[PDB]
Structure 1
Amino acid sequence: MNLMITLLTNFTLATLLVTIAFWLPQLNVYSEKPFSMKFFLVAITFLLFDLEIALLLPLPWASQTTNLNTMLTMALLLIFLLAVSLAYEWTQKGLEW
């Protein structure tokens, strides 16, 4: 709850900074007066590589176990599949401009 106290203090002080930015000047003086496809490919590309990152990233917590051969095997299989997806969109001229 200590970090909740930190989040609360930072949020409240930042809101006070925003209200100093807005409601400070008391001198109320004079009030006066299409999308593309290739944007969308980048987001889903990021999304699927992020999902395979989520699959990869608990690797170093796993490094203390006995079945080292299967670990190294499926780890190389995961990075290889990720690079195969990248090479697939690379050779099928997908993310090009």
Structure 2
Amino acid sequence: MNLYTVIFINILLSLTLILVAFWLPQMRLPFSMKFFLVAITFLLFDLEIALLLPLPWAIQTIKTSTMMIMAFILVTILSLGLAYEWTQKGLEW
């Protein structure tokens, strides 16, 4: 609730400003696979981040060995994905 209170004031402050703006002064084919490709890579990386996001809680896991063994494998396999992105003209705009 406390957050809700703050946020609605936040929207109100902005909606107030746009309105004032309008009310006070009364007196086609841009495409480059590179751009699409980036967006994609971005999510593959964003989804990877999502897998890495639990690592702060997983640090405290009793296993530890498996934690790191897992995390290191994830980071390494994605980075190799990047590596091949390099070989491919990908990442070369």
Q: Normalised by the size of structure 1, how large is the TM-score? A: 0.86
Q: Which residue number in structure 2 is paired with residue 6 of structure 1? A: 6
Equivalenced residue count is 91
The runs of 5 or more residues in structure 1 that have no matched partner are 28-33
Write 1 or 2 for the structure with the bigger share of helix: 2
Q: Secondary structure at the match of 1:95?
A: coil
Distance 2:61 2:41 in 1: 33
Q: Secondary structure at the match of 1:24?
A: helix
Larger radius of gyration: 1
Q: Normalised by the size of structure 2, how large is the TM-score? A: 0.89
Which structure has more RCO (C-alpha within 8 Å, separation ≥ 6)? 1
Q: Which residue number in structure 2 is paired with residue 62 of structure 1? A: 58
- 1:13-52 map, 5 Å: 13-27=13-27, 34=29, 35-52=31-48
Distance 1:91 1:26 in 2: 58
Q: Which residue number in structure 2 is paired with residue 31 of structure 1? A: none
| AA of the residue aligned to 1:50 | D
